[PDB]
Ligand binder design. Structure first.
Ligand SMILES: CCCCCCCCCCCCCCCCCC(=O)OC[C@H](COP(=O)([O-])OCC(O)COP(=O)([O-])OC[C@@H](COC(=O)CCCCCCCCCCCCCCCCC)OC(=O)CCCCCCCCCCCCCCCCC)OC(=O)CCCCCCCCCCCCCCCCC
Ligand SMILES: CCCCCCCCCCCCCCCCCC(=O)OC[C@H](COP(=O)([O-])OCC(O)COP(=O)([O-])OC[C@@H](COC(=O)CCCCCCCCCCCCCCCCC)OC(=O)CCCCCCCCCCCCCCCCC)OC(=O)CCCCCCCCCCCCCCCCC
Ligand code: HEA
Ligand code: HEA
Ligand SMILES: CCCCCCCCCCCCCCCC(=O)O[C@H](COC(=O)CCCCCCC[C@@H](C)CCCCCCCCC)COP(=O)(O)O[C@H]1[C@H](O)[C@H](O)[C@@H](O)[C@@H](O)[C@@H]1O
Ligand SMILES: CCCCCCCCCCCCCCCCCC(=O)OC[C@H](COP(=O)(O)OCCN)OC(=O)CCCCCCCCCCCCCCCCC
Ligand SMILES: CCCCCCCCCCCCCCCC(=O)OC[C@H](C)OC(=O)CCCCCCCC[C@@H](C)CCCCCCCC
Ligand SMILES: CCCCCCCCCCCCCC(=O)O[C@H](COC(=O)CCCCCCCCCCC)COP(=O)(O)O
Ligand SMILES: CCCCCCCCCCCCC
Ligand SMILES: CCCCCCCCCCCCC
Ligand SMILES: CCCCCCCCCCCCC
Ligand SMILES: CCCCCCCCCCCCC
Ligand SMILES: CCCCCCCCCCCCC
Ligand SMILES: [Ca+2]
Ligand SMILES: [Cu+2]
Ligand SMILES: [Cu+2]
Ligand SMILES: [Cu+2]
Ligand SMILES: [Mg+2]
Lengths: 299, 184, 66, 55, 139, 143, 551
């Protein structure tokens, strides 16, 4: 049964997630088989090799079995070698990036919430083209000599901005709307500290870093497609501060026609809440809700 | 025969000290790779007219320190004191020479908060300068012990292990001097 | 609920402690049983002496019998 | 008496400093008395060791 | 002490191989070229074992077989004085207190407390070094 | 002649072993009662400046003569007081060294025997020895 | 043949028997004893930190803890329980038996050995002292990632005290590691060759080398971090590349550090299995090679904690991490082989060691799962990790620590801990740990990240958190039997009048009295193998061991 051998892993909504889950089940099966053998050996000697209450002489004093030691050294090497090959095969597929993506998403993380922007939309069938690049506000952060290569630490030019942006709020969980069955590119850029872009249904995550280019970090990952619609929760996974646990987000997957319509209201000045209601979708997140401002029940 | 326990302990600890400088070297190399073309950037202008004579003095201190070791093994306590006093004076000149270079660099705009190069340069050389200062304290403490009791083989061992630290400090500076003032 | 959650956290460790303690603490330890006057002295002779004060002519003594 | 400056320099709550001194006004003298009594008697034992065993 | 030096040489070879391989494997495959912070540590990790290993090699070739280095050695072979071992000292606790005073000053950035800690450390270290060498009082 | 797992070292000391889960002392008395007896023996000798000894075992045919030889094993026999009890023989023998003579032990020797005997009818062995030590130590002056 | 003996051993020394000894001791035995008491004080202090966290994660919402308090809780909990409890007790056991194992009268540097204890104790107190500050202690986690630990994101003095407290404690660890290497090389007894020492001594010497590679780089990194917060330096500036720079150095420290607190406890069980199995240690030569391979491999695998960063060469570190699984697997097969065809009696030191084998393996299996980047891409920074490292760190620093304590308590006391009370403690600890950490495997996989103070009722994590909360309190109440056993058995325990209370000891400490004298040895037997005590106590088995050594 795949539901029990996954140990709680979500089924997945992307082809990469499905492949990753397949590797997880096989690795768990291999791990359980090895664990059962070792546990069985430990239990066998703990129940049948106990001091009998009539055995006078001490047991045979053997502590060297050269044929056995070599055999139990090669076998573990073979198992990891087999797992390593499948490990390399799967990670190459998950980190593969198509040179011509159809949806590009600018993911901006800060303390303590998320901002989502639509950098570029260009459907493969040519039914929807859009350019969300906004160069009139990205270069306003230039700051210059400078402590680091002529620029101050407050340069912030690495950040990306778009005309249509979904800004998170302490009383409104940000919602990211993506088309179903379409390739999505995620560009992760932090603002002050490291955050974590994790969608449990994606079965994949990458840490959001400030100045990823200067840190030699590949902050861009892509998914082949999303195989079903619905709402999926997303959490911050890297520790970032006081509200690390209260900056969750939601990913909404809709039909390509619904996604194309949703962009139209956003271009028409409509906010995220009302634009979602215009395509017969809930205005607020349903998988997660905003956390209470009350620092606690004793406040 | 017998392995020198104090020498073994000092050598083992000296190797660990090398890993402390490994962190400092990592910061300098990481910042160097992110320079983008200017290393060191303006307005920092390193000069070899002052670093080279100061570096040569520290290198020459190793020779005088080794001369004291020969006197220590020979049982000549007075010869050990003469060579270590000279080594202390030239070792002190290294600190004053480094401090003099720090003043001019700060006046020209190269400071720890001023630039990223200033941070990697000052902490790497400054922590080494602290090691030189700590070595100078070791020289004074050992010399003070020589006038307290007769010159014993245990006393001579303490002189040898102190020179091991001084030789390690001089070797580290050569790596720092070549990395900073030549590998730009 | 909130009552069941607090009961399990504060109850199960105490219940498990009591059950497990009765299994082991009621067992007989390696200490030998107390000697009884009726039973004969089968143990080896025992000589006990204090360590104080910190470091053969007999001046006399007394007898007795019970 | 110097709690306010200690609070500012050493980053301690001013209420904490007052109550630390308040509770410590009776707890600390008791602790020091016990330590000093054992320390003084412990020093006597250290001297007895040299007398009966040498340096 | 042949085995003692062989242990560090075995570690030296592996550390040298890992440092060279990983440097050459990141220069052509890691994003951004050589991993510097990461490589520098591996290269100087070899130096830690190289310094200790080389010194142990030189020491081993000077002294002959020790009683503890003899396969079949007798207990009476090692009879004699071993050396000087300190019986008691309250200086180490003072050195730790002196170092902790400077650390607290450094943590809170108190220049006066840092200076006091440095002076305390030198005074405490001086007592440890001179503890078994101070002569009798001359009156 | 050595027990199983026991060996004679180079310096003459005996390096003995015991099976795991077993005891090396296994005195047939409760641990707390042994502590009280030790306190009576240690503190009683301290207040009397005379070593106090307790022996449990056979005393041969003549109990009086056996205790004399047993006291020789007690450290500092001259300033040692030995209380011998034989549960099988149901006899109590008290013997003291020469230095103990004239210190007030002659009036406490029957006192300890009677006090120990009174508790010996009740089935309490350790309690009888503890009571005997207390009264015998309380009737002996320092030095 | 009548010998005069006390009815009971003296319960405690007279007035003033310890206080002046504590601050002036150079004896490793007393110093090792002071380690265990302080290490367990920090164990209890750090354990209380987790109880507050565990009781807050029982029901959704902040009932009695704020986000800042919870953030401070796990940072200080991890810092105390890895660096203030696990690392010192590595040298706590080493100051106990290592000079005895090699037949030495003391450590190489008695003064420097005592300096390490006080330096560590005052360094640990400085970091904990951040709680009394109004801002609080460190709240950024024990990995102290950058630029979170920055003055801009961590301006309080609690983080500053955390940095300097680690530096002082790190200096003591370096000095302790220096002492152990010198002691093993120079203080070996005649006839004790390199390949004749006990496995525990081999592990400590290997571990001390790992200390010299890891701790100095941590001290260098922390000093650079202190410069950024105080001098306004750009060492760890994100634009300068310091986000990756700090993580690389910190993990170059960290993964050697976890094996600093793993190999010595591998040695501890390696000394207990042969004793209670009446058999020689299986693969004694192979175990040394496995330990050396583990030490060497642990240095070039530092970046497998950095899979989610997307800035490291995944194929290099994934393959190298997989290589560590082979020597670790060899250790289990040697330990299982030691118990194979033996005579097991399952005493408290043996019972804890058996629990180590069951507990460690499950955490080890989870390690191989995390070693592959594709599987780590989903479970990184989640409770699947927390479940993995509390199975691997509780299998050793606790199970093996308790096994060594029960094993070596009569040696350093002359008294035996209660076996009935010991069995209760082991079973309570086992049940509580399994209950509180088995369900966390499902929690992390379900989508619950680590370092979360609060979760929503709709997240579906309530049921498993309550079960984990129940088990954690069982671990808390499991401390009472052990503390009571140590408190009572120290003074009223069963006396030990024999050199080896366990009968079939192999290392040299079982050839001396309990407790050993000031110089640990009034005599020395002939050393011809790795079990001099077994040869001395059982001369008739010398011939049998030589003939039956090879299968
Ligand atoms: C922290 C800051 C310090 C503030 C001031 C400190 C005051 C010191 C007081 C003092 O003199 O103490 C000794 C003092 C006795 O001094 P003494 O007169 O020289 O000795 C008389 C004895 O007869 C002596 O008889 P003995 O020598 O035969 O005693 C044997 C045994 C006694 O053992 C016992 O029976 C005690 C029970 C053990 C506790 C069980 C815990 C479980 C741990 C498991 C470990 C496995 C191994 O003691 C030991 O060997 C213990 C050594 C380890 C102690 C470590 C101390 C390091 C701290 C340094 C600061 C100074 O002890 C007391 O009677 C005090 C009782 C109150 C103690 C509770 C204090 C709580 C603090 C928590 C401690 C955790 C550390 C962190
Ligand atoms: C830093 C750690 C440096 C200590 C590492 C020692 C490894 C060698 C093992 C050994 O032989 O132990 C000797 C001995 C161990 O005691 P023992 O058990 O009686 O050993 C008996 C020996 O057989 C009896 O042998 P001995 O009596 O003939 O003495 C041998 C000793 C000869 O001792 C001396 O004559 C001079 C050593 C004085 C220490 C330098 C003062 C440090 C203050 C720095 C101030 C500037 C900032 O030779 C050495 O230990 C080599 C030390 C070479 C100087 C390296 C200074 C590094 C400081 C770098 C600054 C950063 O300890 C010492 O004599 C010196 C240890 C210093 C402990 C203080 C550590 C905290 C310093 C905090 C600095 C941060 C400032 C803010
Ligand atoms: C040796 C290592 C070690 C040990 C032994 C433990 C012990 C325990 N730990 Fe911990 N832990 C870590 C190492 C360890 N931990 C590390 C490295 C982290 C990560 C830190 C980080 O996230 O940054 C971590 C973090 C961590 C987490 C996840 C952090 C998160 O939420 O993000 C959790 C889960 O609740 C946990 C729980 C426990 C529990 C229940 C115990 C049980 O063992 C504890 C029960 C023990 C007790 C002793 C109970 C106390 C009993 C008393 C009687 C208290 C009374 C005391 C006094 C009166 C002084 N710890
Ligand atoms: C004692 C401490 C200890 C030990 C021994 C280990 C052992 C291992 N650890 Fe781990 N680890 C930690 C302490 C430890 N770890 C801590 C504290 C963290 C996180 C701390 C933090 O981030 O705050 C961590 C995190 C950590 C990570 C980072 C994951 C992440 O952050 O996302 C990884 C990645 O690979 C890892 C892997 C391993 C592996 C492969 C082993 C291997 O050594 C285990 C191998 C053991 C076996 C394999 C069992 C024996 C083998 C057999 C019986 C044969 C079976 C053969 C096969 C299955 C082929 N652990
Ligand atoms: C001179 C030393 C003598 C010491 C000897 C021993 C005596 C010490 C007794 C301990 C006393 C501590 C009790 C203080 C009780 C108290 O009143 O303080 C509380 C704050 O907690 C605390 O103090 C906890 C800290 C406890 C300190 C522990 C003591 C260790 C120190 C003293 C050791 C010194 C180091 C050695 C020095 C070296 C020199 C040589 C030896 C809250 O006040 P506040 O701060 O207003 O916080 C508000 C909320 O209350 C309110 O809800 C709301 O949340 C807000 O309003 C909040 O602001
Ligand atoms: C102990 C550390 C001492 C403090 C060092 C320091 O903070 O000096 C920094 C200072 C830069 O100050 P700045 O704002 O640039 O203005 C200077 C105008 N002349 O001026 C400097 O840059 C001087 C730096 C000298 C090198 C100090 C190295 C210290 C190494 C250990 C830290
Ligand atoms: C005997 C005093 C011991 C310390 C007393 C307090 C020790 C108190 C420990 C029990 C109570 C802890 C239960 C949990 C309380 C809590 O959930 O927090 C609420 C509180 C509002 O928040 C706090 O932060 C509490 C203080 C945290 C502990 C500071 C530890 C200081 C470390 C060292 C500085 C100690 C030096 C000892 C020095 C000892 C004296 C030497 C002379
Ligand atoms: C500060 C010295 C400046 C001189 C430079 C040349 C170095 C030679 C010093 C010889 C000192 C002789 C003292 C002596 O033997 O007296 C000894 C006692 O004096 C000391 O212990 C002095 C310790 C000094 C500690 C401070 C060191 C600071 C170092 C700072 C480094 C920057 C012998 O005394 P005695 O003969 O027993 O009466
Ligand atoms: C639908 C729920 C399935 C739950 C399966 C639980 C499997 C537990 C395996 C434990 C293995 C321990 C080694
Ligand atoms: C592309 C330039 C690389 C320079 C690497 C720096 C190596 C310097 C080593 C100097 C060692 C001198 C002993
Ligand atoms: C293309 C750059 C090649 C760099 C080779 C590795 C240099 C390592 C320098 C380490 C210096 C440590 C002191
Ligand atoms: C001693 C082992 C304890 C293991 C506890 C596992 C409990 C699992 C409960 C799962 C409930 C799912 C609804
Ligand atoms: C190494 C894999 C360990 C897996 C542990 C699984 C525990 C069972 C959890 C059951 C939860 C049911 C909802
Ligand atoms: Ca809660
Ligand atoms: Cu975040
Ligand atoms: Cu976060
Ligand atoms: Cu790891
Ligand atoms: Mg992470």
């Amino acid at each position: 049964w795949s539901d029990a051998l996954a140990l709680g892993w979500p089924t997945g909504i992307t082809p990469e997630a499905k492949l990753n889950r397949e590797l997880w089940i096989g690795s768990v099966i291999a791990s359980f088989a090895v664990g059962a053998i070792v546990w069985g050996l430990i239990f066998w000697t703990s129940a049948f090799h106990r001091k009998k209450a009539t055995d006078t002489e001490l047991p045979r004093q053997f502590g060297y079995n050269m044929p056995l030691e070599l055999t139990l050294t090669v076998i573990p090497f073979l198992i990891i070698s087999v797992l390593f090959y499948f490990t390399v095969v799967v990670q190459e597929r998950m980190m593969h990036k198509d040179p011509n993506p159809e949806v590009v998403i600018d993911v901006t993380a800060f303390q303590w919430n998320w901002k989502f922007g639509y950098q570029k939309i260009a459907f493969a069938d040519g039914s929807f083209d859009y350019d969300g690049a906004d160069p009139e506000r990205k270069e306003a952060m230039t700051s210059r000599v400078g402590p680091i290569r002529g620029m101050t630490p407050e340069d912030r030019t690495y950040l990306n901005f778009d005309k249509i942006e979904t800004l998170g709020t302490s009383s409104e969980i940000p919602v990211l709307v993506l088309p179903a069955g379409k390739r999505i590119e995620f560009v992760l850029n932090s603002a002050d500290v490291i955050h974590g872009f994790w969608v449990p249904e994606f079965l994949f995550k990458r840490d959001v870093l400030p100045e990823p280019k200067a840190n030699n970090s590949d902050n861009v990952f892509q998914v082949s497609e999303i195989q079903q619609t619905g709402a999926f929760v997303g959490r911050c996974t890297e520790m970032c501060g006081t509200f690390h646990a209260m900056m969750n987000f939601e990913v909404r997957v809709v039909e390509p026609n619904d996604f194309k319509a949703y962009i139209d209201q956003r271009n028409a000045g409509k906010t995220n809440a009302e634009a979602l209601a215009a395509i017969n979708q809930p205005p607020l997140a349903i998988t997660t809700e905003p956390f209470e401002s009350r620092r606690g029940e004793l406040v | 025969n017998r392995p020198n326990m104090v020498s073994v302990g000092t050598i083992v600890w000296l190797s660990s000290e090398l890993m402390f400088f490994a962190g400092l070297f990592a910061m300098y190399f990481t910042a160097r790779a992110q320079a983008g073309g200017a290393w060191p950037p303006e307005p920092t202008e390193l000069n070899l007219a002052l670093a080279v004579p100061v570096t040569l003095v520290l290198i020459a201190s190793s020779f005088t320190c080794q001369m004291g070791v020969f006197a220590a093994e020979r049982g000549d306590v007075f010869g050990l004191r003469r060579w270590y006093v000279i080594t202390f004076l030239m070792g002190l000149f290294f600190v004053l020479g480094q401090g003099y270079e720090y003043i001019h660099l700060v006046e020209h705009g190269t400071t720890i908060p001023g630039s990223a190069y200033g941070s990697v340069f000052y902490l790497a050389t400054g922590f080494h300068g602290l090691h030189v200062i700590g070595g100078l304290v070791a020289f004074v403490l050992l010399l003070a012990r020589t006038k307290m009791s007769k010159f014993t083989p245990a006393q001579a061992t303490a002189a040898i292990v102190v020179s091991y630290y001084w030789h390690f400090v001089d070797i580290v500076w050569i790596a720092l001097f070549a990395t900073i003032y030549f590998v730009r | 609920s909130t009552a069941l959650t607090h009961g399990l956290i504060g109850g199960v460790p105490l219940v498990l402690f009591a059950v497990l303690a009765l299994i082991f603490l009621t067992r007989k330890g390696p200490h030998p049983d107390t000697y009884k006057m009726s039973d004969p002295w089968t143990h080896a002779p025992i000589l006990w002496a204090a360590e104080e004060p910190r470091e053969v002519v007999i001046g006399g003594g007394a007898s007795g019998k019970w | 008496c110097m709690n306010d400056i200690i609070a500012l320099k050493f980053h301690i709550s001013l209420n904490a400093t007052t109550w630390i001194g308040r509770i410590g006004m009776v707890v600390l003298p008791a602790i020091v008395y016990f330590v000093a009594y054992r320390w003084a008697i412990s020093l006597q034992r250290s001297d007895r060791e040299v007398l009966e065993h040498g340096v | 002490m042949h085995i003692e030096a062989r242990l560090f040489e075995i570690l030296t070879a592996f550390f040298a191989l890992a440092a060279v391989v990983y440097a050459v494997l990141t220069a052509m495959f890691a994003t951004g070229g050589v991993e510097w912070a990461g490589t520098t540590a591996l290269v100087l990790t070899t130096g830690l074992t190289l310094i200790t290993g080389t010194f142990f090699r030189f020491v081993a070739r000077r002294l002959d077989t020790r009683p503890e280095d003899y396969e079949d050695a007798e207990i009476s072979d090692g009879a004699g004085e071993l050396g000087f071992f300190a019986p008691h000292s309250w200086w180490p606790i003072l050195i730790s207190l002196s170092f902790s005073t400077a650390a607290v000053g450094a943590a809170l950035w108190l220049p006066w407390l840092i200076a006091a800690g440095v002076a305390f450390v030198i005074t405490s270290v001086c007592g440890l070094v001179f503890e078994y060498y101070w002569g009798p009082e001359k009156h | 002649d050595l027990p199983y797992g026991s060996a004679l070292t180079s310096s003459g000391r005996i390096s003995a072993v015991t099976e795991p889960g077993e005891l090396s002392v296994h005195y047939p008395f409760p641990t707390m009662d042994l502590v009280v007896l030790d306190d009576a023996l240690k503190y009683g000798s301290r207040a009397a400046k005379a070593r106090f000894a307790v022996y449990i075992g056979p005393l041969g045919a003549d109990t009086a003569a056996t205790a004399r030889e047993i006291l020789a094993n007690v450290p500092t026999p001259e300033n040692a007081v030995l209380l011998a009890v034989s549960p099988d023989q149901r006899a109590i023998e008290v013997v003291y060294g020469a230095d103990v003579k004239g210190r007030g032990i002659e009036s406490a020797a029957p006192l300890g025997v009677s006090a120990a005997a009174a508790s010996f009818k009740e089935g309490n062995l350790i309690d009888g020895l503890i009571s005997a030590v207390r009264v015998m130590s309380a009737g002996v002056s320092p030095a | 043949e009548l010998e005069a003996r006390r009815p009971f051993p003296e319960r405690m020394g007279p007035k003033g028997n310890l206080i002046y000894k504590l601050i002036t001791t150079t004896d490793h035995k007393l110093i090792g004893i002071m380690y265990c008491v302080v290490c367990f004080a920090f164990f209890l202090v750090g354990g209380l930190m987790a109880l507050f966290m565990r009781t807050e994660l029982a029901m959704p919402g902040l009932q009695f803890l704020s986000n800042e308090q919870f953030n401070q809780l796990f940072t200080m909990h991890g810092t105390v329980m890895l660096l203030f409890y696990a690392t010192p007790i590595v040298f706590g056991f080493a100051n106990l038996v290592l000079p005895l194992q090699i037949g030495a009268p003391d450590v190489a540097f008695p003064r420097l050995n005592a300096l390490s204890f006080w330096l560590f104790l005052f360094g640990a107190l400085i970091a904990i002292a951040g709680f009394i500050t109004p801002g609080g202690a460190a709240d950024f986690g024990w990995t102290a990632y950058s630029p979170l630990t920055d003055a801009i994101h961590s301006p309080g003095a609690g983080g500053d005290l955390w940095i300097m407290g680690l530096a002082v404690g790190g200096l003591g660890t370096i000095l302790g590691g220096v002492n152990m290497i010198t002691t093993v090389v120079c203080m070996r007894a005649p006839g004790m060759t390199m390949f004749r020492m006990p496995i525990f001594t081999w592990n400590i010497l290997v571990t001390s080398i790992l200390v010299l590679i890891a701790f100095p780089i941590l001290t260098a990194a922390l000093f650079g971090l202190a410069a950024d917060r105080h001098l306004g330096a750009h060492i760890y500036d994100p634009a300068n590349g310091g986000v990756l720079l700090w993580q690389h150095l910190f993990w170059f420290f960290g993964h050697p550090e976890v094996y600093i607190i793993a190999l010595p406890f591998f040695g501890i069980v390696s000394e207990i299995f042969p004793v209670f199995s009446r058999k020689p240690i299986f693969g004694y030569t192979t175990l040394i090679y496995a330990t050396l391979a583990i030490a060497a491999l642990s240095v070039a695998v530092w970046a497998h904690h950095m899979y989610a960063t997307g800035a490291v060469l995944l194929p290099f570190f994934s393959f190298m991490t997989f290589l560590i699984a082979v020597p670790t697997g060899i250790k289990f097969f040697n330990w299982i082989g030691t118990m194979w065809k033996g005579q097991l009696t399952f005493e408290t030191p043996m019972l804890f060691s058996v629990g180590f084998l069951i507990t460690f393996l499950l955490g080890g299996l989870s390690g191989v799962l995390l070693a592959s980047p594709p599987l780590d891409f989903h479970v990184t920074d989640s409770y699947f990790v927390i479940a993995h490292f509390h199975y691997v760190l509780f299998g050793t620093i606790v199970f093996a620590t308790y096994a060594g304590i029960y094993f070596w308590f009569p040696k350093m006391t002359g008294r035996l801990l209660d076996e009935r009370l010991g069995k209760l403690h082991f079973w309570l600890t086992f049940i509580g740990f399994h209950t509180t950490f088995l369900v966390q495997h499902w929690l992390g996989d379900e989508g619950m990240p680590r370092r979360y103070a609060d979760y929503l009722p709709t997240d579906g994590f309530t049921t498993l958190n309550v079960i984990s909360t129940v088990g954690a309190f069982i671990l808390g109440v499991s401390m009472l039997p052990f503390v009571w056993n140590v408190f009572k058995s120290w003074r009223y325990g069963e006396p030990v009048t024999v050199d080896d209370p366990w009968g079939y000891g192999n290392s040299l400490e079982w050839a001396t009295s309990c407790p050993p004298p000031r110089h640990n040895f009034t005599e020395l037997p002939r050393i011809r193998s790795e079990r001099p005590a077994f040869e001395l106590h059982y001369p008739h088995m010398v011939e049998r061991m030589r003939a039956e050594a090879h299968v």
